[PDB]
Amino acid sequence: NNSIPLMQGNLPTLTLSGKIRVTVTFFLFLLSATFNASFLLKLQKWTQSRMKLLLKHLTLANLLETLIVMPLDGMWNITVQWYAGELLCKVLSYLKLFSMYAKAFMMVVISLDRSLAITNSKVGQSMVGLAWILSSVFAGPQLYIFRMIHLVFSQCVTHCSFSQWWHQAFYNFFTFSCLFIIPLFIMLICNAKIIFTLTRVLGIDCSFWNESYLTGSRDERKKSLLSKFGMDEGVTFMFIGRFDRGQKGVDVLLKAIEILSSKKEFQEMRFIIIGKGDPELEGWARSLEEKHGNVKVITEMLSREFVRELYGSVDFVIIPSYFEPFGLVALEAMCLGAIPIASAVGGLRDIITNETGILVKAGDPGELANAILKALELSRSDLSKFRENCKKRAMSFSNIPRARLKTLKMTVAFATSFTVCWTPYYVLGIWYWFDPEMLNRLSDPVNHFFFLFAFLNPCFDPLIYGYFSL
Ligand SMILES: COc1cccc(-c2c(C)n(Cc3c(F)cccc3C(F)(F)F)c(=O)n(C[C@H](NCCCC(=O)O)c3ccccc3)c2=O)c1F
Ligand SMILES: CCCCCCCCCCCC(=O)OC[C@H](O)CO
Numbered sequence: 142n143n144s145i146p147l148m149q150g151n152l153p154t155l156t157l158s159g160k161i162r163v164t165v166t167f168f169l170f171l172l173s174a175t176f177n178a179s180f181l182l183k184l185q186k187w188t189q190s191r192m193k194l195l196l197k198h199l200t201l202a203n204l205l206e207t208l209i210v211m212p213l214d215g216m217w218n219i220t221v222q223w224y225a226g227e228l229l230c231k232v233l234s235y236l237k238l239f240s241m242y243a244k245a246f247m248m249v250v251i252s253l254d255r256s257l258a259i260t261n262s263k264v265g266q267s268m269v270g271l272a273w274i275l276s277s278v279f280a281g282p283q284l285y286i287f288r289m290i291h292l293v294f295s296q297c298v299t300h301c302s303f304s305q306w307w308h309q310a311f312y313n314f315f316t317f318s319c320l321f322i323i324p325l326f327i328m329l330i331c332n333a334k335i336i337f338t339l340t341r342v343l344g345i346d347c348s349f350w351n352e353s354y355l356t357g358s359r360d361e362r363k364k365s366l367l368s369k370f371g372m373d374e375g376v377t378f379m380f381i382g383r384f385d386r387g388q389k390g391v392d393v394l395l396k397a398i399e400i401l402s403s404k405k406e407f408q409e410m411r412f413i414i415i416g417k418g419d420p421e422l423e424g425w426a427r428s429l430e431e432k433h434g435n436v437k438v439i440t441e442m443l444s445r446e447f448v449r450e451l452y453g454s455v456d457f458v459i460i461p462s463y464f465e466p467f468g469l470v471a472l473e474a475m476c477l478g479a480i481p482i483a484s485a486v487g488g489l490r491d492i493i494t495n496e497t498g499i500l501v502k503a504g505d506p507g508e509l510a511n512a513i514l515k516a517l518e519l520s521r522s523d524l525s526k527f528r529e530n531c532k533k534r535a536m537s538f539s540n541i542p543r544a545r546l547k548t549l550k551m552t553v554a555f556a557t558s559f560t561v562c563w564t565p566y567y568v569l570g571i572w573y574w575f576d577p578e579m580l581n582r583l584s585d586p587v588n589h590f591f592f593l594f595a596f597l598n599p600c601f602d603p604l605i606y607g608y609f610s611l
Contacts, residue, residue, distance in 0.1 A: 142306070143577065145313050145570075148234045148287060148297040150219040151580060159219070162589050166215040169593055173207040173600030180603040191265040192548045195254060196606060198269040199247040199555075203599040206240040211596060213237060223297040227289035230297035234287040235280050238316070242276035244599065245324040248559050255552040256331035258545060259338045279319055282312070313574060321567045325560060332556045335549055337488070340467050342546065345539035349445075350473045352532070355453045359478065362454040367411060370437050376517045377411040379455040379479070381448065381470065382462070384418030384426075384440075390461030390484065391416060395425050396506035397461075397513065398436065402429070406517060413455065415439040453477035457516055460489060463503055468492050475535035478528045482512050496527070497534045547609045554605040562598035565591045 152159065177200050184197045213233060223230060250268045286302045289295055303309040355362060364374050382389040394414065401407050414426055417440045426438040452458070458474040460483035468488030471481045475497070483489040484503035493500050501512045541549070569591065572579055 143574070144299055144309060145574060146298075147237070148218065148230065149223070150221055152220045155220060156585075158585070162585070163216050163219070166211065166589075166593065169596055169600065170207065170211040170215070173211070173596060174204065176600055176603045177204040177207065180606065191254065191261065194265050195247070195251050195269065198272070199244075199251060199602065202240065202243040202247045203602055206244045207596070207599055209233075209236045209240045215592060218297075221296065222294045223289060224295075225297075227297075230289050231284050231287050234283045234297065238283050238320075239276055239280040241320055242279050243273060245320055245559075246272035246276050248555060249324050249327050251552055252328045252331040252556060255548060256334050259335055259549065286312070317567070317571055317574075321563060325564075328556045328559065332553055335553055337467070338541070339549055339553070341469070341472060341488075341538050342541045344467070344469050345472055345476065347476065347536075347539055350449060350452075350476045350539075352453050352477050354449065355477075359454070363456070366450070366454045370413065372411055372435055372437065375409045375411045375435065376457075376520050377413065377455040378457040378459050378482070378513060378516070379413045379415070379451055380459045380461070381415040381451075382460075384416050384422040386419060386422065388463055389416075390463060390503075391418075391422055391426070393461040393484075393504065393506050393509055394459055395422070395429065397509040398429060400507055400510040401513060402433065406514065407433075408435075409517060410513070411435050411437075413437045413439065413451065415443070417442065448473075449477060452479045455479050456520065457482050457513075459509070459513070460484070461503070461509055462486055462489070465489050471498075472535045472539050475531035476539060478532060480516070480524065480527060480531060482509070482516060484509075492535070492538060494530075494534065497530045547611075551605060551609045554609070555602060558598045558601055558605060562595050566595035 180200050181197065181204065184193060184200070187193065214237075218224075225233075247269070250272050254265070254268065286299050287297060288299075288302055289297050290300055299309070303312070363377060367374055367377065380391065380394055382391060384391050386392060391414065398412060401410070412435065414437070417423070423438070423440055426436075427440075429436045430438045452474045456479070458471065458479045458481045460468075460471055460474075460481055462484055464486055465483075466487040468483075468491075471483060471489055471492055474481055475492075481489070481493055481498040483493060483498065483500060485500045486503045490500070499512050499516060501508050569579075569583075
């Protein structure tokens with residue numbers, strides 16, 4: 142009853158505009174074929190690494206899915222009758238699923254290898270072998286379950302092949318998951334990690350944010366700055382952010398300061414808080430600026446050159462944020478030698494280790510107060526190895542080899558192309574599965590369009606490599 146026309150078209154006859162549309166499909170077939178062909182040749186002529194090893198097998202599955210499904214579904218078997226024989230109906234139904242299982246499992250193997258590469262052997266080729274293995278084993282049943290029926294005219298269908306209704310439901314469910322949904326799952330997850338890396342890497346201009354441009358010794362830099370402002374020398378914490386309520390944490394710091402205000406070791410501490418935003422939060426800071434001469438507040442925005450000034454002079458960066466999935470202030474800061482004190486709320490949770498700063502629970506004014514107190518209790522011993530750890534840790538987060546970087550940006554493009562182009566094709570597939578009478582509500586122009594939109598992905602893959610090839 143509720144099956145899927147995987148090898149059967151839905152046009153009683155061929156309209157003139159149908160013959161126009163098949164010619165237009167022939168175009169996209171030709172763009173795809175000659176391009177993945179000319180990209181395959183580029184690869185062997187460039188063989189006379191592993192990221193090349195995987196692009197060959199992806200492009201090989203691209204060519205294979207283009208040569209099999211574009212003529213089958215787009216040019217030939219588009220009417221409701223099967224014009225070949227029973228043998229070519231079981232072989233072609235096999236090759237159709239085989240070439241699509243293979244294209245997906247290649248995007249899975251690349252998304253998996255590159256997600257690992259952000260942390261030259263045999264494992265490289267055992268992945269793509271498994272990909273061709275699974276995709277050939279998963280398409281096996283299509284040889285037995287498809288048959289040519291002539292009850293009139295002939296068609297290549299699964300009718301009267303499964304017994305119970307559950308035998309067929311689980312088969313088509315298995316086809317959908319292992320064709321699109323499960324790969325999309327594995328892909329989106331692996332490419333989510335690569336997105337975090339790229340954001341950090343392409344987000345720190347290390348050619349600017351580095352300590353080679355500073356002048357002289359670090360404590361000279363601090364004396365000179367602390368009297369530039371107009372306070373005397375002491376342990377220095379700094380905050381630079383938008384004055385926000387429930388967002389960046391300036392209220393937490395301010396209340397933490399007022400806890401630390403009438404205290405025992407408050408006299409040794411300097412605080413430079415910087416930022417503009419809501420107005421009631423500035424009057425709080427600026428009132429602590431008149432009650433205490435070791436609290437400077439700067440709401441005028443500064444120069445790019447003067448932020449690097451401070452990161453490599455202050456003793457600590459207080460980063461009391463509520464939500465910070467990337468953490469670039471902490472990486473600029475650490476790149477210049479400053480020690481971070483931040484709330485474990487995202488990238489700060491991942492960026493600050495045990496020997497690279499002090500993490501605290503977010504949103505608590507106290508506890509931050511005790512962190513600021515722990516930080517000063519460990520300043521009596523001169524922290525030089527402590528600052529080199531942040532310099533090197535933040536260095537790695539912000540820096541990536543050029544070569545491994547283009548393949549990183551490449552993989553994210555491959556995935557987005559697959560996610561974008563194949564999602565409309567396959568949801569109408571699952572939509573049809575739940576309600577077959579949905580087909581009676583869709584154009585021939587839009588059925589044709591979402592067919593072409595899907596095969597934009599495999600013929601633009603070669604374009605994605607070439608683009609990120611400088
Ligand atoms: C496990 O399920 C699977 C597995 C693999 C592929 C398909 C698969 C998908 C996802 N779509 C997308 C699609 C629809 F489903 C329904 C409406 C519109 C579209 C559109 F996006 F194209 F607009 C296809 O069109 N075909 C083409 C398929 N006819 C095969 C013969 C060629 C033709 O029909 O001319 C078909 C047509 C209409 C309904 C169901 C199947 C597919 O085989 C599939 F359903
Ligand atoms: C847009 C269609 C496909 C998109 C694939 C995105 C993969 C999902 C991971 C999202 C991670 C994220 O933080 O997204 C934010 C990104 O900076 C958007 O500009």
